[PDB]
Nucleic acid binder design. Structure first.
Lengths: 286, 375, 230
RNA sequence: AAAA
RNA sequence: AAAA
């Protein structure tokens, strides 16, 4: 049984022999991570393993545990039951596992570079998870699994003017120019949240400054959507001052994740999950 | 010649080393270093660990055992290869990878590892352990580090610049005294970089690096070594190819204007203009944005033209006007902020206002004044 | 042709030593036998003697500039004196007084080494050859304080002057323009303001009111720090 | 404009 | 705008 170890030191340059050689010789070691029934967690993790094997046929979950110690639970943002609408539960969920999972897992694989492979379940929480991850992570965001966000600076392109918008249509509506706050309805999911969010802003927040961005071909790359979204945001933040932004958005988990990656914690941003509660605030992410 | 090991003496292929037990002829030492020597000694030391000091004076204290292949196996004791040692004693410029960070030490270690890999891309002989062994700069000294988020107090920012930044480059350049410094710089907080570059000055050769997050590899976006083009203001407005500069004068009597730079993605123009017109009572402005690709500047290409045209616009705004005070509000790449602080320096009455994400309104605050940093 | 590298600095002593070492290397690649230990050995001129030095920042009071020029600078270039001077200084305006009282170098920062680039009757003499336009500031100071309306502006490649050749054409053109203006119109008092490299300022001095711009000073930023005819 |  |  002492063969592979010697074989290992015969393949270091710094089931199958190719798997061991690429485990000891690659640099961009993948890590598939799911945000989440535990049986369904196992099924989704197996699907993620297959998807990351499509590009890295030498990578395996058991091999990952043997080589780096990262178990499937370490890659799992787990917790039983449906998510309560209370903000304390979401804040504690981010603080417990999601806050330092990336730091710990990158600390485990110290010499090699990292290519994350992220999948998720809940939409409005993907912004918090992406803000935790940040724009500085070489990450493939997947969606059978299909990788839809290839980020391995184009994700943060705001050059696209309102005239040459290929995918989305933006409509910034300002009724109180002296009030520095903005509603940020983003309509890219399934149901139309425009009326409910408008009523909520005009009733429970007294906001009449709202941003409306508005099912999607999963085969293509998903970067121009994020580019035009950020462009609309920063064209709105051009001749006016805003001190609070509130998301009321429906969209694929992948795109919300990438939007949390891009916009991040810089803007004063409180996402209100809809089943309408500030489960987290982006400026309070760090 | 004298070499110290935990000492040896080297005289001008027979590298005969004398010893109390038995004199031996390590001919491969002479072969590795291309000089025949008669190694001296003062006391009997067990173990053949005196090889590395001999070989280093041939080519501070050293420890290790040489091999005929040139690989070194076991104060400098963390080296492995002969070429690393060769280019560690015989180079002209010592890379000094400086990273500014605010957070936890684990991400600091990761950031420094990435910056070390970038330096090794151009200087394969470099490494952090070898740097700390060869000259004593640890990872913390190259780190402009403070735990957690900086409080949004201008006193805290000025203090952080004082205790660490104001003397960091001076002390590090004093440490590597005989050799020039090729400063490899990256930072974290963009507004801090204006102060870091103003204290850095235009008198230091620097590779200011930005990371391509697609590969988690830094890129030499400001190459100011091998720097006068750093301070080129010969560019005219009609000859602008990278930046887009506007100059609004609504109160010519007042000698005050707001300098706003938008070369990142998160637009600061509205917030900064509101801050100037509502808290500083300023109507004159110098607004710089990108020409074509706003929010993305190609990290592969040289970023020097951006700063060239920015500085040309800044000094063209000063052609027929006198400005008692300039107010700087920027979103921009970390490296670009550092380069702009390097070029502009302390010569203008510029108060730089940082935008804090986790702060109540107003989120701008004059954390420092560019002319007041030398005080 | 004995080396004599004189450098003006105002700040900490360690940065002064760093600047001195760079200047020593610049002499060494032209005179290999020279060194600072050599300078303190054969001649005894120690590194502070060749340094026009002042701790901290020079205060923005005229008495300070006159004290600096008379106590050290006036006797510096005279008493320290075959010999050839390599000069490069910190303050651009102080070189005007220094020159008025040879290889004049300017530092190229990419490789971090110098390069020998030199081998009403009231008017505002104006020079803009650096990268910080003083035209507006000096013009406003003239109009509001000294009541000046006539100017002589000296100004190609602006902000980059090729520090691998001779800058003598620049100084010769400036001298020709100044002499032409003097022939055309008599100037009892010509007021000089400049943003320029320290090397060209020293050369211009080597070739009558002078004002200086201080970064950490309150308005007015310009004052008549000395007269070139005193 | 305080090594332009 | 806290590795843009």
């Amino acid at each position: 049984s002492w063969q592979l170890a010697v074989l290992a030191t015969l393949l270091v340059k710094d089931k199958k022999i190719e798997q061991l050689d690429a485990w000891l010789n690659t640099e961009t070691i993948p890590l598939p991570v799911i945000q989440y029934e535990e049986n369904e967690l196992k099924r989704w993790q197996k699907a993620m393993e297959q998807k990351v094997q499509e590009k890295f046929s030498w990578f395996s979950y058991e091999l990952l545990e043997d080589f780096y110690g990262i178990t499937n639970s370490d890659l799992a943002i787990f917790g039983n039951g449906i998510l309560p609408f209370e903000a304390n539960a979401w804040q504690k969920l981010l603080q417990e596992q999601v806050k330092d999972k990336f730091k710990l897992l990158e600390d485990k694989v110290m010499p090699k570079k990292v290519l994350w492979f992220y999948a998720g379940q809940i939409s409005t929480l993907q912004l918090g998870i992406g803000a935790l991850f940040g724009f500085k992570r070489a990450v493939s965001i997947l969606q059978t699994y299909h990788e839809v966000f290839i980020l391995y600076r184009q994700l943060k392109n705001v050059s696209v003017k309102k005239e040459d918008y290929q995918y989305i249509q933006s409509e910034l509506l300002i009724n109180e120019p002296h009030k520095n706050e903005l509603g940020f309805i983003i309509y890219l999911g399934s149901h139309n949240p425009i009326g409910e969010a408008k009523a909520y802003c005009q009733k429970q927040l007294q906001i009449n400054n709202f941003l409306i961005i508005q099912v999607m071909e999963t085969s293509q790359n998903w970067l121009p959507y994020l580019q035009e979204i950020n462009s609309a945001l920063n064209t709105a933040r051009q001749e006016y001052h805003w001190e609070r932004i509130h998301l009321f958005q429906t969209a694929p988990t992948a795109l919300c994740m990438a939007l949390g990656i891009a916009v991040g914690h810089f803007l004063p941003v409180d996402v209100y999950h809809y089943q309408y509660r500030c489960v987290f605030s982006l400026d309070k992410m760090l | 010649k004298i070499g110290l090991f935990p000492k040896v003496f080297v005289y001008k292929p027979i590298a005969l080393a004398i010893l109390g037990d038995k004199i031996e002829n390590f001919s491969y030492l002479a072969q590795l270093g291309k000089q025949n020597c008669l190694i001296g000694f003062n006391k009997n030391i067990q173990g053949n660990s005196w090889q590395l000091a001999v070989l280093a004076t041939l080519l501070i204290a050293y420890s290790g055992i040489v091999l005929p292949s040139g690989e070194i196996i076991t104060l400098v004791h963390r080296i492995k290869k002969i070429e690393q040692l060769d280019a560690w004693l015989n180079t002209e410029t010592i890379p000094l990878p400086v990273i500014q960070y605010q957070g936890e030490e684990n991400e600091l270690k990761r950031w420094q590892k990435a910056m070390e890999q970038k330096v090794q891309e151009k200087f394969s002989w470099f490494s952090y352990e070898l740097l700390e062994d060869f000259y004593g700069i640890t990872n913390s000294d190259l780190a402009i580090f403070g735990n957690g988020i900086l409080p949004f107090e201008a006193n805290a920012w000025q203090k952080l610049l004082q205790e660490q930044v104001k003397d960091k480059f001076k002390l590090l350049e004093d440490k590597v005294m005989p050799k020039k410094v090729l400063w490899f710089y990256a930072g974290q907080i963009s507004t801090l970089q204006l102060g870091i570059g103003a204290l850095f000055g235009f008198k230091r050769a620097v590779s200011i690096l930005q990371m391509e997050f697609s590969n988690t590899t830094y890129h030499e976006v400001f190459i100011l070594y091998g720097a006068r083009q750093l301070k080129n203001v010969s560019v005219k407005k009609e000859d602008y190819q990278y930046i887009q500069s506007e100059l609004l004068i609504n109160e010519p009597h007042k000698n005050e204007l707001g300098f706003i730079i938008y070369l990142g993605s998160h637009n600061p123009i509205g917030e900064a203009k509101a801050y100037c017109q509502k808290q500083l009572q300023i109507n004159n402005f110098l607004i710089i944005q990108a020409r074509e690709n706003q929010g993305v500047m190609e990290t592969s290409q040289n970023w020097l033209p951006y700063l060239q045209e920015i500085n040309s616009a800044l000094n063209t705004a000063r052609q027929e006007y006198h400005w008692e005070r300039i107010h700087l509000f920027q979103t921009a790449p970390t490296a670009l902020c550092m380069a702009l602080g390097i070029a502009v320096g302390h010569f203008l009455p510029v108060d730089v206002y940082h935008y804090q994400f986790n702060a109540e309104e107003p989120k701008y605050r004059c954390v420092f004044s560019l002319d007041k940093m030398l005080n």
